[PDB]
Design an enzyme around this catalytic site. Structure first.
Site, mmCIF file in Angstrom:
data_model
loop_
_atom_site.group_PDB
_atom_site.id
_atom_site.type_symbol
_atom_site.label_atom_id
_atom_site.label_comp_id
_atom_site.label_asym_id
_atom_site.label_seq_id
_atom_site.Cartn_x
_atom_site.Cartn_y
_atom_site.Cartn_z
ATOM 1 N N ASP A 56 0.831 -1.195 0.000
ATOM 2 C CA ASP A 56 0.000 0.000 0.000
ATOM 3 C C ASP A 56 0.869 1.250 0.000
ATOM 4 O OD1 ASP A 56 -2.574 0.852 -0.250
ATOM 5 O OD2 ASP A 56 -3.064 0.773 1.885
ATOM 6 N N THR B 110 -3.888 4.867 -3.928
ATOM 7 C CA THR B 110 -3.030 5.743 -3.138
ATOM 8 C C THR B 110 -1.665 5.956 -3.776
ATOM 9 O OG1 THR B 110 -2.215 3.898 -1.813
ATOM 10 C CG2 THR B 110 -4.201 5.009 -1.067
ATOM 11 N N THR B 111 -1.211 5.031 -4.618
ATOM 12 C CA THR B 111 0.059 5.187 -5.317
ATOM 13 C C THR B 111 -0.094 5.973 -6.611
ATOM 14 O OG1 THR B 111 0.721 3.044 -4.408
ATOM 15 C CG2 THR B 111 2.059 3.953 -6.184
ATOM 16 N N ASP C 228 -8.516 -2.844 1.219
ATOM 17 C CA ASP C 228 -8.550 -2.183 -0.084
ATOM 18 C C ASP C 228 -9.643 -2.777 -0.968
ATOM 19 O OD1 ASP C 228 -6.480 -0.498 0.616
ATOM 20 O OD2 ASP C 228 -5.323 -0.894 -1.204
HETATM 21 N N1 LIG Z 1 -5.088 -7.548 -14.251
HETATM 22 C C1 LIG Z 1 -4.633 -6.312 -14.561
HETATM 23 N N2 LIG Z 1 -4.182 -6.024 -15.801
HETATM 24 C C2 LIG Z 1 -3.727 -4.800 -16.121
HETATM 25 N N3 LIG Z 1 -3.680 -3.774 -15.256
HETATM 26 C C3 LIG Z 1 -4.104 -3.922 -13.980
HETATM 27 C C4 LIG Z 1 -4.613 -5.230 -13.551
HETATM 28 N N4 LIG Z 1 -4.956 -5.103 -12.258
HETATM 29 C C5 LIG Z 1 -4.689 -3.824 -11.888
HETATM 30 N N5 LIG Z 1 -4.177 -3.125 -12.915
HETATM 31 C C6 LIG Z 1 -3.770 -1.700 -12.888
HETATM 32 O O1 LIG Z 1 -2.643 -1.518 -12.035
HETATM 33 C C7 LIG Z 1 -2.708 -0.211 -11.468
HETATM 34 C C8 LIG Z 1 -2.052 -0.186 -10.095
HETATM 35 O O2 LIG Z 1 -2.974 -0.560 -9.078
HETATM 36 P P1 LIG Z 1 -2.438 -0.671 -7.568
HETATM 37 O O3 LIG Z 1 -1.159 0.119 -7.488
HETATM 38 O O4 LIG Z 1 -2.419 -2.118 -7.142
HETATM 39 O O5 LIG Z 1 -3.555 0.125 -6.734
HETATM 40 P P2 LIG Z 1 -3.107 1.235 -5.661
HETATM 41 O O6 LIG Z 1 -2.670 2.398 -6.516
HETATM 42 O O7 LIG Z 1 -4.354 1.475 -4.852
HETATM 43 O O8 LIG Z 1 -1.994 0.580 -4.882
HETATM 44 C C9 LIG Z 1 -4.176 0.177 -11.432
HETATM 45 O O9 LIG Z 1 -4.331 1.500 -11.946
HETATM 46 C C10 LIG Z 1 -4.876 -0.816 -12.337
HETATM 47 O O10 LIG Z 1 -5.530 -0.126 -13.404
HETATM 48 MG MG LIG Z 2 -5.186 -0.811 -5.741
#
Ligand SMILES: Nc1ncnc2c1ncn2[C@@H]1O[C@H](COP(=O)(O)OP(=O)(O)O)[C@@H](O)[C@H]1O
Ligand SMILES: [Mg+2]
Lengths: 532, 52, 205
Positions: A54, A87-88, A391
């Site tokens: 996170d 959040t990232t 989350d």
């Molecule tokens: N299966 C997937 N295939 C392609 N992109 C994905 C997939 N799952 C999530 N993502 C993308 O990865 C990005 C990063 O999400 P993440 O960093 O895990 O959420 P957060 O920013 O809350 O930590 C998201 O913007 C999402 O669109």
């Molecule tokens: Mg996420």
């Protein structure tokens, strides 16, 4: 000249320093974005380890000094509080916006024009997202919730286990569903008590069709299981009665001391008898219970739990229909406990979980509740599972509340970049550069995903931009708006069909917050740091 | 120190003894609810008052 | 030699920047010297007895905690000492351990403080090198065992030279009882953890 006791930075120096701080904060968490992202080990120089992905948690644990980096950290925290996801992405977008805006400023563009262009670009991006890139969830069904939960849990310790964890999350969220006035179905997340306990694998995580207490019986005498529970929730301690501060016992006749001392506990005896005379089986109280009252409960074959948390007691009372009684006082000045003040549950069992015990209030009536027991390999894994699960719950709540979702995998960012690059030519003469730089900065998310995947980021992003450009130029190619990224195979993919979704609120709030943070930092052009 | 502002806004009059607590010392309002600021805290809002 | 009434006048107002620059460091050192004054020389110069419960108390202390024994925090600097004694709640007791490497009578009380921290979550047992603080020669020659106790931001226990009243290889219970002699000790096992906005729950309404 000034004779001020401190340091002063003016002009390009302070702006470059602010951009450096923002870029450092962004680079801290840039490596934990997207499914091919990886977690981080955090040690607090005392021996405590926090394995987390996170962004909000990482930025919260770190101790930061520069004010702009602190601004980005609070931005991540605010995004976590108001949305729960992204959040990232918000931090990365804000830092990229700041960097490009500072480049424009160093190109002798006045910061006011850059701010105006950024504001116009943010408005247009939000409008374009809400007009074109939203997918209504009415026709998708539970598959939309499952896919949103799976997407949220990707890039986490529960990634590949999504097929099971998404169903678990959706079931919990639907269980805690309630409706209120104005006909709004509101889903109160944080009503799902998340209990962690190392032991069996992740597949053994249990979804309790009731509530789970991290508490045990006060004494070994009481039975550990009751079938037809009559839960009585209390907000006061059950101890030997003590006179208040303003009351003092003064004895002049020796004959009365024994009567005084006897009634001193007969009061609590009578209260317990009044409570138990209505058939109560399980008694939960926030206060303590001493030995004598525990034995009173033991002899009646009841279940008495002491030091129950206030929020846990409130949730149990709400789910079981019991009313929390801070005192046994009615409107007639008496001491009574009516039968209507009793909750009802289908079972109350004290189960054993890895040489430890917890109380399971199973299948409460008049309301359906839910609790989650997370089984991992150690405490660090359990904590990371809890964070990822929270989350996912927040994402599912957002999808259920607002029925609009957008494709994931950088599709929305690429479409926004293309549209804003096209649109910048229709507004202003000098803020058009600011709008174009906003559009270019919006491309930092797919670039970061591709970089984390160790693929050809340049070519992949070029292909994605070409697909979205063809979608936005040809009227008949609206189906190409959903083209995102397939990180596993390193090729563009129709993410809407592939099941990569996320709430629209996440993107909208992240865009607004990042734009506001970039505007706030961009105004600074002179820093005075007084000597402590 | 907020008593004066509250009494000027709502229209209530402070009561220091239960003997003088009567209906004439109350301030009628249209609505009084505790709104939720999207997880950023709770705000207690009293909107709509006779004789503002 | 006349004009002794200098009345420096314009001088200071053009140099108060440097004057305050020196004064800040002077004050920063001053907190350290004033704090160490209250210990460095304040008091440097000046069959029921078998306790059958001591053995069972030691046995219960051996099973103190499951996760780990944990270690006593090692203070690395003087201003760190100052801003940890001044920080934290004043209602908690903070115990500071003074020692130097090599002197006998140390490791036993290190282990004792380890056991105490394991059993007592409230207290803030910590350790710091004697030389790091900068004690005098007399302290480094005859005052190695020093028990510094903080409460409310001020000292309430100032034990030094505790070898005679404790021993050399004393157990945890012995030092615990010694500390209890002056009323210095303030008065279930979860699975792993429980603590997970403010929206709690509602129903239908
Ligand atoms: N299966 C997937 N295939 C392609 N992109 C994905 C997939 N799952 C999530 N993502 C993308 O990865 C990005 C990063 O999400 P993440 O960093 O895990 O959420 P957060 O920013 O809350 O930590 C998201 O913007 C999402 O669109
Ligand atoms: Mg996420």
């Amino acid at each position: 000249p000034l004779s001020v006791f401190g340091d002063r930075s003016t002009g390009e120096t302070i702006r470059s320093q602010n951009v450096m701080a923002a870029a450092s904060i962004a680079n801290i968490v840039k490596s934990s974005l997207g499914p091919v992202g990886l977690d981080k080990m955090l040690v607090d120089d005392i021996g405590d380890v926090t394995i987390t992905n996170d962004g909000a948690t990482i930025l919260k644990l770190l101790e930061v000094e520069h004010p702009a980096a602190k601004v980005l950290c609070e931005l991540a925290d605010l995004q976590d509080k108001e949305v729960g996801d992204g959040t990232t992405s918000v931090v990365i977008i804000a830092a990229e916006l700041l960097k490009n805006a500072d480049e424009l400023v160093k190109q002798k563009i006045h910061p006011t024009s850059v701010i105006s262009g950024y504001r116009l670009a943010c408005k247009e991006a939000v409008r374009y997202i809400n007009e074109n890139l939203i997918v209504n969830t009415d026709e998708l069904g539970r598959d939309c919730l499952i896919n949103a939960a799976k997407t949220s849990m990707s890039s986490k310790i529960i990634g590949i286990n999504g097929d099971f964890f998404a169903n678990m999350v959706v079931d919990a969220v639907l269980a805690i569903k309630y409706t209120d006035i104005r006909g709004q179905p509101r889903y109160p997340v944080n009503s799902v008590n998340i209990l962690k306990a190392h032991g069996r694998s992740q597949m053994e995580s249990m979804l309790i069709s009731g509530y789970a207490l991290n508490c045990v019986v006060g004494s070994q005498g009481m039975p550990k299981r009751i079938v037809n529970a009559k839960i009585a929730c209390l907000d006061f301690s059950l101890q030997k009665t003590k006179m208040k501060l303003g009351v003092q016992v003064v004895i002049t006749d020796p004959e009365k001391l024994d009567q005084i001392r006897q009634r001193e506990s007969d009061i609590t005896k009578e209260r317990i008898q009044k409570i138990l005379a209505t058939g109560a089986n399980v008694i939960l109280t926030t206060g303590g219970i001493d030995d004598m009252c525990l034995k009173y409960f033991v002899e009646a074959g009841a279940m008495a739990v002491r030091r129950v948390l206030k929020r846990d007691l409130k949730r149990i009372a709400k789910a079981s229909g019991a009313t929390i009684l801070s005192t046994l006082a009615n409107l007639e000045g008496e001491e009574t406990f009516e039968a209507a003040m009793l909750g009802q549950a289908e079972e109350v069992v004290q189960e054993r979980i890895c040489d430890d015990e917890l109380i399971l209030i199973k299948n409460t009536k008049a309301r359906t509740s839910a609790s989650i027991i997370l089984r991992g390999a150690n405490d660090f894994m359990c904590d990371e599972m809890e964070r990822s699960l929270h989350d996912a719950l927040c994402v599912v709540k957002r999808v259920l509340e607002s029925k609009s979702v957008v494709p994931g995998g950088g599709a929305v960012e690429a479409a926004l970049s293309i549209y804003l690059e096209n649109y910048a030519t229709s507004m202003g003469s000098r803020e058009q550069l600011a709008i174009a730089e906003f559009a270019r900065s919006l491309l930092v998310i797919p670039n970061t995903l591709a970089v984390n995947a160790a693929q050809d980021s340049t070519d992949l992003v070029a292909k994605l931009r070409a697909f979205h450009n063809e979608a936005q130029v040809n009227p008949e190619r609206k189906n190409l708006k959903w083209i995102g990224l397939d990180l596993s195979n390193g090729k563009p993919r129709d993410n809407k069909q592939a099941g990569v979704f996320e709430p629209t609120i996440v993107k909208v709030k992240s865009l607004k917050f990042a734009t506001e943070a970039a505007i706030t930092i961009l105004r600074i052009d002179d820093l005075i740091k007084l000597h402590p | 120190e907020d008593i004066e502002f509250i009494c000027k806004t709502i229209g209530t009059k402070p009561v220091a003894h239960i003997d003088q607590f009567t209906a004439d010392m109350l301030g009628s309002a249209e609505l009084a609810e505790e709104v939720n600021l999207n997880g950023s805290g709770k705000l207690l809002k009293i909107t709509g008052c006779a004789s503002p | 030699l006349a004009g002794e009434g200098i009345s420096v006048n314009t001088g200071p107002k053009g140099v108060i920047n440097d004057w305050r620059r020196f004064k800040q460091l002077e004050t920063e050192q001053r907190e350290e010297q004033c704090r160490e004054m209250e210990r460095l020389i304040k008091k440097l110069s000046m069959f029921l007895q078998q306790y059958r419960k001591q053995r069972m108390e030691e046995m219960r202390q051996q099973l103190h905690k499951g996760p780990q024994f944990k270690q006593v925090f090692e203070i690395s600097s003087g201003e760190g000492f100052l801003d940890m004694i001044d920080k934290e709640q004043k209602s908690i007791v903070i115990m500071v351990h003074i020692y130097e490497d090599g002197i006998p009578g140390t490791e036993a009380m290190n282990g004792c403080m380890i056991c105490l921290a394991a059993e007592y979550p409230a207290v803030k047992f910590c350790k710091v090198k004697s030389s790091v603080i900068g004690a005098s020669s007399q302290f480094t020659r005859n005052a190695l065992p020093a028990l510094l106790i903080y409460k409310g931001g001020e000292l309430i226990g100032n034990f030094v030279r505790v070898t005679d009243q404790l021993g050399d290889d004393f157990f945890a219970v012995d030092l615990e009882a010694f500390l209890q002699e002056f009323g210095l000790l303030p008065e279930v096992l979860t699975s792993v953890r429980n603590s997970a906005s403010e929206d709690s729950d509602l129903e239908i309404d």
